[PDB]
Design a binder for these strands. Structure first.
Ligand SMILES: [Mg+2]
Ligand SMILES: [Mg+2]
Ligand SMILES: [Mg+2]
Ligand SMILES: [Mg+2]
Ligand SMILES: [Mg+2]
Ligand SMILES: [Mg+2]
Ligand SMILES: [Mg+2]
Ligand SMILES: [Mg+2]
Ligand SMILES: [Mg+2]
Ligand SMILES: [Mg+2]
Lengths: 141, 119, 124, 210
RNA sequence: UUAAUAGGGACGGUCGGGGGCAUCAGUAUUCAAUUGUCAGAGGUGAAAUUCUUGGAUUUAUUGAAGACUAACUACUGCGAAAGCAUUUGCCAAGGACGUUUUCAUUAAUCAAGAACGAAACUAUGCCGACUAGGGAUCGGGUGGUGUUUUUUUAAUGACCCACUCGGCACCUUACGAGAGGAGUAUGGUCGCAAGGCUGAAACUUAAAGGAA
């Protein structure tokens, strides 16, 4: 099922059936909001924000506890990324792979992986352009 | 008992019987199958090896050596690692000569990695 | 490939070893090996033109015996292959249906009675 | 006179077979006053000389005997190694080629169809030959062992063994003729620069419309 | 709107003989230096060829060069394929697993196009959209248990059993429209072919041979 690979793995998260907050959860919805903005101000991404809240504060899901996703909560308070997170990391990996290539000019394998990452960016970059999340003039490098 | 050292190099085509000190640095006597036979076909025969051992054993007793440590070997390297027929014959002849055999070991050159082209 | 003597020796090596330099020349060979050698040669020439049903006929044996011979023979083949497979020994490839030809096959002349393969399954 | 001893480990699967024959191995070595020990816990075979040993070299042949038994050679064949003329040789074959498919295919060429090629080589050289993994184990007279090595090595270098089988038969016939002994038998024998950065990708039709 | 046992990304401990740059080892081969002894040493089926009393081969010590990575090596691991096996460090990358983290259909198959890239010589397996399995094995995870292990220095595994995801294969299974060979004969055509001793014919002819 993997793209650019022969793997067929199925590891993933299984969201619980019920869609309300847990009974044991006894923290105000507002206090979660200020925790979210504090972390995003510090420089954490929404994915990393979710991990910290779930691990140490009992926030099973931001949507479930607060009624809105981490993305929407941050945008409501003036915090939203310049580019989508998944595209941000894919560009960051592409730069690192490129940076390795100048120093090592005989690494034909790294040349191959750069195709897969760059081609992945185009497909993702195409999608956001259609939805108007990313401005149409946006080109990769 | 004075101890010598007997280097037996048993190739498929010839057998060397070389006796030397414990250091191995000074030769006491060296005899080869070719010297004890008249034909180039029979140098590797056990008969040639037996004669070489007898001459060496006589020469050892004169100088004073009464016992020897045997370190037999084959051609080794990239070729066969099994000693030739002379190697066994030389060892048996030395015992019959009366020289006490101290210790027997194989010192075949076994390459960690032979120089052979993969292509 | 077209050298008859070389190919004949290669195909007949198993019989000569079982029923034994080595006397592979037609004049030197004596005993059961010469009787088995002639039959193998004659069958090979016959297979090209002779109809399969009539050229080869398994000798008649009662029911209970033949299943006994096949069951033991397959047991011997399984032991021979398993001991080799668990070890490093490389064995000659055999078609799926046919029984492997172990040393006992040539010595006991089992093939004439059990046959190369169970023809019923090859049909199915 | 200290005792010269040699130990050879054996795999666990040979435990059943070795146990049954060990009385025979003990008898065969006892003819030469060589003591033997089979350790089923450590899975090891030991041969050691005794005070009654009169022949110095037999211990080497005892050592080879346990080596052959560990490598799955049958005892009736393995016990022949005790004879002076017999010898054992191990030929490496994994180092000849780099392609796995070519390696297996050439190895199969040694065994041949139905095992005919191996058996033909065994009969002509009077040698017991076993093909295992990355090696070929051979046992027989020294002249036979020499012949097996040239066939095995040349087979891995793309020379069909059937050529070597044919030459062996001719040489055996020729050796029986005295007149041509002096004469050579060669006549009668058969004969731009890599770029690190990729090109860009061609944009999809939708991207052109975007 | 869901958050697909669709897909993409994130986080955690990991796994690999995946790749690139350095670095370390190893015995062997060739060569060189010393050095004990002396007539042969390699090679073949025999030789020839080659080296050699200016010491060959062989013995011991030492140095250098190139290649290679034995035994461990497996119907095992990694890689898109070709391929990859010494230690250590650096550089990025990758798979699966675990997740009550995140985007929200962003995907599948793809002619065009782009990236990488002497030899053969006995083989062979019905195929598929497809059921239930068995033994063994590799990587990850959960639980049980009691042996190795061990103690407030840091780290913290090995083995057994049960379960589960994903692999390399092996052995069985239920289901399915999956739409010339071998020879024979030839009043034809085109080719190839017979003989009488040589010399020796326009010459009944010499020497010397062949035959007997
Ligand atoms: Mg992934
Ligand atoms: Mg999902
Ligand atoms: Mg990771
Ligand atoms: Mg790595
Ligand atoms: Mg070096
Ligand atoms: Mg190694
Ligand atoms: Mg390397
Ligand atoms: Mg491994
Ligand atoms: Mg793989
Ligand atoms: Mg599985």
């Amino acid at each position: 099922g993997r793209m650019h690979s022969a793997g067929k793995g199925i590891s993933s998260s299984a969201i619980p059936y019920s869609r309300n907050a847990p009974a044991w959860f006894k923290l105000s919805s507002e206090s979660v909001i200020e925790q979210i903005v504090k972390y995003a101000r510090k420089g954490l991404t929404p994915s990393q924000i979710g991990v910290l809240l779930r691990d140490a504060h009992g926030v099973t899901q931001a949507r479930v506890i607060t009624g809105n996703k981490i993305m929407r909560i941050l945008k409501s308070n003036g915090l939203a990324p310049e580019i989508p997170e998944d595209l941000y990391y894919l560009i960051k990996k592409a730069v690192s792979v490129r940076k390795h290539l100048e120093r090592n000019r005989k690494d034909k394998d790294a040349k191959f992986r750069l195709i897969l990452i760059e081609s992945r960016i185009h497909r993702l970059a195409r999608y956001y352009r259609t939805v108007a999340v990313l401005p149409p003039n946006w080109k990769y490098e | 008992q004075v101890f010598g050292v007997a280097r037996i190099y048993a190739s498929f085509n010839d057998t060397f019987v070389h006796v030397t000190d414990l250091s191995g640095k000074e030769t006491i006597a060296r005899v080869t199958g070719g010297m004890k036979v008249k034909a180039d076909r029979d140098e590797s025969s056990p008969y040639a090896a037996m004669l070489a051992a007898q001459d060496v054993a006589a020469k050892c007793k004169e100088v004073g050596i009464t016992a020897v440590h045997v370190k037999i070997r084959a051609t080794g390297g990239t070729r066969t690692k099994t000693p030739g027929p002379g190697g066994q014959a030389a060892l048996r002849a030395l015992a019959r000569s009366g020289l006490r055999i101290g210790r027997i070991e194989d010192v075949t050159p076994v390459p960690s990695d032979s120089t052979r082209k993969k292509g | 490939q077209n050298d008859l003597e070389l190919q004949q020796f290669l195909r007949e090596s198993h019989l000569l070893s079982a029923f034994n330099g080595i006397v592979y020349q037609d004049d030197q060979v004596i005993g059961k090996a010469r009787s088995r050698t002639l039959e193998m040669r004659l069958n090979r020439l016959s297979r090209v033109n002779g109809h399969q049903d009539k050229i080869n006929k398994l000798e008649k044996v009662p029911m209970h015996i033949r299943r006994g011979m096949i069951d033991k023979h397959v047991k011997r083949i399984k032991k021979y292959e398993q001991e080799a497979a668990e070890g490093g020994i490389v064995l000659s490839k055999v078609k799926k249906g046919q029984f492997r030809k172990i040393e006992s096959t040539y010595k006991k002349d089992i093939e004439r009675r059990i046959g190369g393969s169970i023809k019923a399954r090859d049909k199915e | 006179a200290e005792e010269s001893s040699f130990m050879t480990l054996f795999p666990k699967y040979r435990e059943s077979y070795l146990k049954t024959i060990w009385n025979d191995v003990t008898r065969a070595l006892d003819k030469h006053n060589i003591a033997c020990v089979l350790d089923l816990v450590e899975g090891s075979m030991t041969v050691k000389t005794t005070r009654k040993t009169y022949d110095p070299a037999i211990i080497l042949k005892a050592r080879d005997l346990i080596k052959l038994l560990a490598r799955s050679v049958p005892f009736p064949q393995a016990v022949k190694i005790l004879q002076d003329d017999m010898a054992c040789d191990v030929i490496k074959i994994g180092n000849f080629v780099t392609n796995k498919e070519r390696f297996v295919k050439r190895r199969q060429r040694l065994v041949g169809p139905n095992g005919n090629t191996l058996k033909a080589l065994e009969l002509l050289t009077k040698c017991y030959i076993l093909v295992q993994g990355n090696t070929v184990s051979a046992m027989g007279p020294f002249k036979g062992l020499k012949e097996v090595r040239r066939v095995v090595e040349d087979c891995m270098k793309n020379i069909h063994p059937i050529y070597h089988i044919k030459e062996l038969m001719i040489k055996r016939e020729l050796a029986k003729r005295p007149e041509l002994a002096n004469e050579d038998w060669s006549r009668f024998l058969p004969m731009k620069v890599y770029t690190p950065f990729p090109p860009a990708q061609l944009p999809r039709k939708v991207d052109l419309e975007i």
